[PDB]
Amino acid sequence: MNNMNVIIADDHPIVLFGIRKSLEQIEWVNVVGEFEDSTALINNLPKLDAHVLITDLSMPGDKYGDGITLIKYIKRHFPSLSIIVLTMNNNPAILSAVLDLDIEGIVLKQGAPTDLPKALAALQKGKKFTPESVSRLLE
Amino acid sequence: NNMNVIIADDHPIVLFGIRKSLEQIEWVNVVGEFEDSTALINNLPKLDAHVLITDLSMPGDKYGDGITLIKYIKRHFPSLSIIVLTMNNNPAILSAVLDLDIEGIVLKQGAPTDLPKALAALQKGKKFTPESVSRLLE
Ligand SMILES: [Mg+2]
Ligand SMILES: [Mg+2]
Question: Quick check: B12 contacting A, CB < 8 Å?
Fold first, then answer.
């Protein structure tokens, strides 16, 4: 596939290792940055020239925040950047509000082990990789 | 001394991270990976494990999870060393888990080197607690 500069952002290092373990088989991926905090993510985002961001939803960093506020900030300040949300919060209202921000993918940590590789493969082909929130939201 | 390790976490990405961390440790031998407590307990006897790196919150209605599961493993597999790997930052839960006489805790919020340090302590015949744990415990 086309070569891709990836930044990964999660406040759990073991999750960051897990992303690297899953992506080490994929040669076209270049992990140009790893961050545990949204301040360090935003300060480094201009300097790295990244095509994709694999971001955690619940994260420390008071200056730029986390979740919806952070994704809203990133898309307004870094419009070329593609965002894959990696979260364990599968709440219908949070997933749908995240979907309304026009992001490229959501991967649940509760889901299948091959979802994060498959989401990057979908992004390369210009397609979406997201779970449906509305049915559970409506309940 | 070589040590067979089983790991238990209900997020596959966490299991991948634990394996990636344990690549660097050559006297560790990852011998099983499990996403629930039922599959863990059913496979525990046939694997000849010396150490178990286990998550606190997992699915499993048969043998339960957290403090119930740790208690089940210590009574039925007393030779097994248990390292608890949790994102729970509640002093009551961590103190209750420590009172079971487990070999070590690792916080998912803590330092990247805490899991390697836990195993290094365990190889020298000692228990381990991160600074993140000892700071919040009172
Ligand atoms: Mg988080
Ligand atoms: Mg869990």
Answer: yes
**Count: domains in chain A:** 1
Residue-range definition of the domain harbouring residue A131? 4-139
Method: X-ray
Burial of B104-128, coded b for 16+ CB within 10 Å and e otherwise, reads: bbbbbbbeeebbbbbbebbeeeeeb
Give all strands (DSSP E) within chain B, no chain letters.
Answer: 3-8, 28-34, 51-54, 81-86, 104-107
List of residues 6+ apart from B97 with CB closer than 8 A: B56, B66, B67, B70, B84, B86, B105
**Burial of A97 from C-beta contacts in 10 A (0-12 / 13-18 / 19+):** middle
Q: What CATH number is associated with residue A12?
A: 3.40.50.2300
Beta-carbon separation of A13 and B111 below 8 A? yes
Nearest CA in chain B to A10: B109
Q: Can you say whether the dihedral through the CA atoms of B53, B56, B59, B61 is positive or negative? A: positive
Range list of H helices, chain A: 13-23, 38-48, 67-77, 92-99, 115-124, 134-138
CB contact under 8 A, B109 and A11: yes
Resolution (A): 2.5
- CA distance linking residue B113 with residue B116, whole number of Å: 5
CB contacts, 8 Å: B11 with chain A: 18, 88, 109-110
Interface size A-B, in CB pairs within 8 Å, comes to 62
